[model samples]
Target: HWGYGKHNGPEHWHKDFPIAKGERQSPVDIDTHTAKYDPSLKPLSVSYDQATSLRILNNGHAFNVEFDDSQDKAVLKGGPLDGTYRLIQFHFHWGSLDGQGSEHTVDKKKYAAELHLVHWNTKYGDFGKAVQQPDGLAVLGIFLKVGSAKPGLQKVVDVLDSIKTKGKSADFTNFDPRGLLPESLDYWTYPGSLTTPPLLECVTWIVLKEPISVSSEQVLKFRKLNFNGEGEPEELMVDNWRPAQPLKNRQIKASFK
Candidate 1:
C-alpha cells in the first residue's frame, strides 16, 4: 500500500514521490510569522447533513468516515473556494507519540494528530474528474490534541474497535461532525496535494489554527489498527503523515489577524 514505511515513508525521502517534486504538495510547515493576514479572506462556511453519514472504514493506513455525496447536502463553500465542494470523507493521521503527530505544523510546533475533511469541487463533475484540475479539491485540516475528551470525538472513537483491521468497516450514521470543530474557524489557506501517493496537486488547503482535544486513551485505539491485510506481514499503522512540502509559488493566507 502507498504509505509511510521503509519504501513508502517520506523516509522514501529525497528520492521517492519524485513526481510530487512537481510542486504544490501538501502538509506544509505553516510559519505563522510569515503568514499573511488577508481581510478579503472569508470565514469558512461548512454545512453538513447528519443523514449523509455513510460508514467508517480502515483504509489500510487510517480510519476514514465516509459520507454520501450524491447531493450537496454536505458541502463546503465560502472561504477561498470559488464554488461548492462536496464532502466525500474524512480521515486522520497520527502517531504513537503523545505529541508531534500532526502534519501541517505551526512554527515548527506539532499537535498530537490531524484530521482532514476531503471534498471535491462540484464544478468538475465528480471526485474522479476533479482531481485532474487545479482547483479540483478543497480539504479542511483540523489539529487534534489530547488532554480531555470531546463528546463528538468519543462517538467516533467508540467505533474504532469495530474497524480494527485493514478493510474492516461499520455503518456510522446521524453523527454531526460540527461538534468536532473548534470554537473558532480561523485558518490558513494554501494550494497543495493529497499528502499521499497519487500525490495530485489539485487541492485548495484550509487548515484551522484552533485544535480540538480528544481523550488520551482514545488515541491508543487508533494504533490497534493493522496496516497489513489479515495474512500479510502484519505491520501496525502509525506515522501516516507527510512532512511539510515547500510553499513554492503559493502563499499562505490567514483568515485572522
Candidate 2:
C-alpha cells in the first residue's frame, strides 16, 4: 500500500520497494553553490525530552510524532553525526498548493513544507537494528515557509482537528521539539534514503539552513488531511512528496561557510 496517487507514486516505488533504486537516495538537490564547507562540521547536539513526546499518529503516510524511544529519552548529537541519535519519530511533507511541496531542494528552490526529524543510532540496538546499519538513521530536514505566525506551529496546528481521519490518534504530549528549530544551526550533510518505503540506505542527511515559518492559513491546515480510512472516500492528502533522488557519487557536507 504505497501512495501519493498517480497509481502508487514515486514511479511505482521500484515495483515494491527494491530499495527504490538504491544508491543513497532521498530528496537530494541542495547545491548551495555546490555544497562542501565542513570545517570539521559538528555542532548540533539537540536534547529533546518534553516527556519524550508520546503520541500523534496518522500513518496513512504522514502525521507521526511518536517519541518515547524506550530510552535515551531523546537525543541527537554533533552534526553529520556518528554516535548518539535516538528520537524515533516526527514527520511532515506537504503541498496542495502554496508554492510547492518540498522534498529537499534549495538552489532548485521549492518549499512549502518538509520536516522529518526521525533519528536512531544508539549504537544500533533498535529502530529495527538501526534500519540495517550503514550508520543507521539521522534524518532532520526542516524547510517550511509560507510566512510568519508560527507560534511554534500553533501546537501542531492545534492537533490538526483531532487527526482528521486516516487511522487517527491523539495523546501527543508536551511537544517541544526544540520549539520547532531554526534559529540557525546552519547545515547540509549527505548520504540519504528512506524518503519512504523500504528505501532505506541508512540516512544521515541533516539538512537545515534557516527556514521555518508557517502561515498562509497555516498552509491550509496541511490540506485538511484524510488519505482515506474509517469510511473511505476522502483522499486528499496533498502531494506527500518524494521526487529528487539521484545524486549518485554523493558528497554534500556543509556547516555554513
Candidate 3:
C-alpha cells in the first residue's frame, strides 16, 4: 500500500496508480497575487447536523471523523459548486514539526498543518460512484497555524489518545463541524484531484484564506499517532501530507480580494 515513508511515498505512487501523475493533481500552491478574484462567487453555505457525526477512526493514513451521509443531514452548497455536496468525512494532514506539514501553501509559505473536509456531489448518487466522475467530489481545505489553542477542536484532540494506533476507531457524535471553520468564508477555488490514490481528477478544491489556530503542544500530539497497528513496528504518523503538484492549465479563482 502507498504511504508517506520513503519506500512507498508520493514519488512512487505513480507506479501503482497511474493517475497519480494526472494533469489535475491536488495540494497545489495558492499564489494569491496570481489568483483571479471572481466577484460572482457565492458565499459558502455550510449546514452540518451535530447528530450526523458517527465515529472517529485511525486509518493509518490519517485520522478521519466519519459522518452519517445516508441522507442530506450535513451538506455544503454554493462557493463555485453547481449543486449540493454532502459531507462524508473530515481528516488532517500534518508533519513531524510545526513549520512544515501543510499540503497547500500560500506564496511558497507553508503552515503547520492542513484540514480536509471531504464531500461528494449528490447528483452522482453516492460517494463511490461520484468519485469516478469528473465533478464528483468537493473538498474544503483549511490551513492550520501554530498559535493559541482552538477550543472548538478540543473535542477531536481528546480522542487522539484512544485511537493512537492504525485501524482503531470509537463512537463519536453530537459534534458540529462548523465550529472548526474560520470566521471568514473567503476561499480560492480550482479543479483538482484527490491527494492520495486513486488520485482521481474529480475534486473541486475550495481552500480557505484564513487559517485556524492551534497550540504547538496540540500540533505535537498529531505526531504521536501511529501509522502501524498493534504488533507491528510503530511508525509515527507525522508528515502524512503530499507535496504540492503542478497547477498545469488550471486557473485559481479567489472569492475575495
Candidate 4:
C-alpha cells in the first residue's frame, strides 16, 4: 500500500516526487587515474540508539529500510565528514539475479549489491526540499559481497519471510543500524549524484573500499523476491547493480592514512 504499484518505479517517481527532475543522482564511475589529489578528507562518526524508527520494507524491486527522526535518540551526528544531515531513506541496488550485485564496477570486478544510506541536510527543512539544493544530500555506500556460508546479512534477511511477496512490509522497531556499518570506516569520499532516476547531482558520497561479505547462498535469498511484485516471479534481484559511470572531471578522495 506504499505506492509501489507497477507504474510506481523510478520511471513514475517524477509524478509523485516533483524534485525528481532536478535531484542529484549517484553511481558515477570513479577514475583514480584521472582524479586530482586531495589531502584534507576526514572520517565520520555514527552511534546507535533505541529510539530509532526502523521500518523494513520490501518494495518489490528490492528490500529497503526507512529511518525517521522519531528514532533519533542515538545517531551519527556532526563531524568533519558529518553535517546536520538527517536521514531520509535508505535502499539497495542489486542485480536481476545472483552472480552480480554491485551498482558501480571498479576495474570490471563486480561484487554483490550495494546498500545506500541516504541523508539530507536539516538546514533545508525536509528531504523533499533539501534535494534541490547543491549541499543537500549525503549517501553512505556499503558494498555487499557474495561468499561461502553467509556474511551475517540475516538481520535484513531474517524478515524476508514476511516480505517475500511484493508490496509486503513489516515494522522493525528500535532497530540499531550502526551494527550494519562496515568494520572499517575507511572510505572513499567524492562529490557525486544519486544513482536512481532523477539522478540528482547534489550529493557527498562516502564509499567504503572494503565490502561486507555475504555468502553466495545468502545472495540467492535476495533473488527470491519478485522484481516488481507483478506475480511473474522474476528471476530475482541479485544483479540489480549499475555499471560505474565516467568520472566526468570529478575528484575522489579517501579518508585513510
Candidate 5:
C-alpha cells in the first residue's frame, strides 16, 4: 500500500508503519563530525565469489538483483557485523536529476544515487526468521557518484529493457556483485532499519566512504523505468530515496580517521 507519491511517501509512512518513528530508523544523515573513529572496528569482508544471481526484477519499488541464499557462497563478514550474513539481493535508489538521490548523505551532501546490498544473518537460521530480530540483517550502502563508466555495473544497466515495468522480471544469472564495490573498505557503521515498508528494525548498516563511478547517461536510463504496470499510468521511477531520520541516541562509528 506504500508508494513514493506525495500521499504515501516518508511523511505519511509513520501513519501505517509506526516503527517508522522508531529510534534507529535508517537512511540517516552521516554527520562526519558527530561520528567518531573506532579502533576496534574491522574492515568489511565481501566474499561474493560464487553466489549465482537468480534474476532481475522491478518489484514496484526498485529493480533488484536477487541471489541464491541456500548457502554462504556470497557471505558478508567482519566490519561491524558480529558473524556471517548471506547476500539476498541488491538494488539502487536514484533521483530524477543528477543533483540528489541517495538515502544516506554525508553531512548534507547528496550523491547521484545509492546502492544497497541486503544480507541476512545465518545465525538466525534464514532470512524469513531473521527479519524480525535485532541483529538479523546487514546492508552495505555504497554511494554512486556521477563520473566515468563502471564496466561491472554496465551489465546490469543493459538488462533494464527487459524489466522496464513494475512486477516484471527476467533471468539474470552469474552476475558477480563484487565488481560493483569501491576499492577501499573504509566505512561508517550504525544500527538502523530497512528503508522500506514493513520497515523492520533489524539492519546493521555499513556505508562505504569511497564511492564507485557511474556515468551521467547511465542515471538517465534508470528514470526510464515505470512505477506502474504496463496498462496503468506512466509514472517515472525516480527519487525513490527516503528522507533521513533523526539519529536519536544511537552512535555512528567510522573505520577510518
Candidate 6:
C-alpha cells in the first residue's frame, strides 16, 4: 500500500526506514551568512568511467545508485572531506506537482527538489558500522528548481523508462552523477540527521546554495512517480518533499579548515 498522510511523514519514517533519522539527514536550506567561509573545503572531481559495480536499486521510496570504489572515482577527498570517505549511494527528492518540488527549506521557504550524495568515513570500516559514528557520514546536497530548463538532467530523465515499476531497476550502465552537480561548489555546513529515519546524528552536512534548473515537464514527470509497485499507473508522488524542519537554534557553519 502507498504511504501518505501526517502520520507517515517525517514523524513516522523512522519506523519503516530506520535510517531516516541518520545523523545527517539532508535537504536543509543553506543559510550562507551564518556560515564561516572555508576555502579548504573543495569539490572532489569524479570520473564515472572508472566506477565499478554500478547497480540501480529501486528502494520502495526512490531510485538509488550504488558504486564500488575504483580509484576513488566517486569519493570525496581533501579539505574537511579528508579521511577515507566512500561513496555508497545517491538519490533524489521532489515535489508532487510541477509548480513545487524540493526537499530542503530555508527561512521557512521550500525549494523545488533535492539531491543527496550519501557517503561514509572508511575509518569506521564499512557503511553499516560507519553510520553509527558521530562523524561517520557526510552528505552533499544540491537543490533543484524549474525555470528556463537546462539539458543536463536529460541523461537522468531519459532513463526513467527503464525503471517504470516498483522493485524495478536497470543495470544503469555508464551512468555518472557527478556531471549533474551545480556549478558552484560553495556550501554551508551543519549538523543534522537524515530527514527520513533513525535520524542519527552522524552526519556532517554540506549544502550548496545554488540550484540546478529543469523544465516543468521534468518536474511533472517526477511528480508522477508511483508509490505503489511498478506496473501501477503513475500516482502523485510529486510533493514527496518533507516539510522544512525547525533549526532548533543550531548554528550551521561552513568548512573553513
Candidate 4 lDDT by residue in tens digits, 117-173: 787777777777877877778778887776644334566767777787667788976
lDDT of 5 by residue, 32-95 (tens): 9989999999888899988889999999889999999998889999999889999999999999
Which residue pairs collide in model 5, if any? none
lDDT per residue (tens digit) for residues 1-257 in model 1:
45778776774644655756867888788999899999999978898753388899988878899998888888899999898999999999998786767989999888889999999999988899999999999999999998888888878888987887789899998778888889999999999888887788899999999999888887887777788766678787778888777778879999999
Model 2, stretches more than 4 Å misplaced?
1-30, 34-36, 43-56, 59-62, 69-74, 80-88, 95-100, 109-115, 118-139, 142-167, 170-205, 208-235, 239-257
What is candidate 5's CA lDDT for residue 113? 95
Counting clashing residue pairs in each candidate, in order, gives 3, 0, 0, 29, 0, 31
**Between candidates 1 and 2, the TM-score winner:** 1
Error of 1 at 35 (Å): 0.4
Which lDDT value does model 6 have at 176?
63
- Greater-TM-score candidate between 3 and 4: 3
What's the best-to-worst order under TM-score? 5, 3, 1, 6, 4, 2
Instruction: Please tell me which model should have the higher TM-score, number 4 or number 6.
Output: 6
C-alpha RMSD for every candidate: 1.6, 17.3, 0.9, 4.3, 0.7, 3.4
Compose the digit string of candidate 2's lDDT tens values, residues 90-173. Answer: 888988986789899998888988889988898878899999987788888989989887787788878977988888989988
Each model's TM-score? Answer: 0.95, 0.34, 0.98, 0.79, 0.99, 0.82
Ranking by lDDT: 5, 3, 1, 2, 6, 4
User: Judged by lDDT against the true structure, how good is candidate 4?
Assistant: 0.64
Worst 10 residues of 6 by lDDT: 44-53
Lowest summed lDDT across 10 adjacent residues in model 5 is found at 1-10
TM value for model 6:
0.82
What alpha-carbon RMSD in Å does predicted model 5 have with respect to the real structure? 0.7
Better of 1 and 3 by TM-score: 3
Compose the digit string of candidate 6's lDDT tens values, residues 18-108: 5554434555665655656766556543334554547776565666777775346566654356575777787788776544556666555
Instruction: Report how far off residue 63 is in candidate 1 (Å).
Output: 1.2
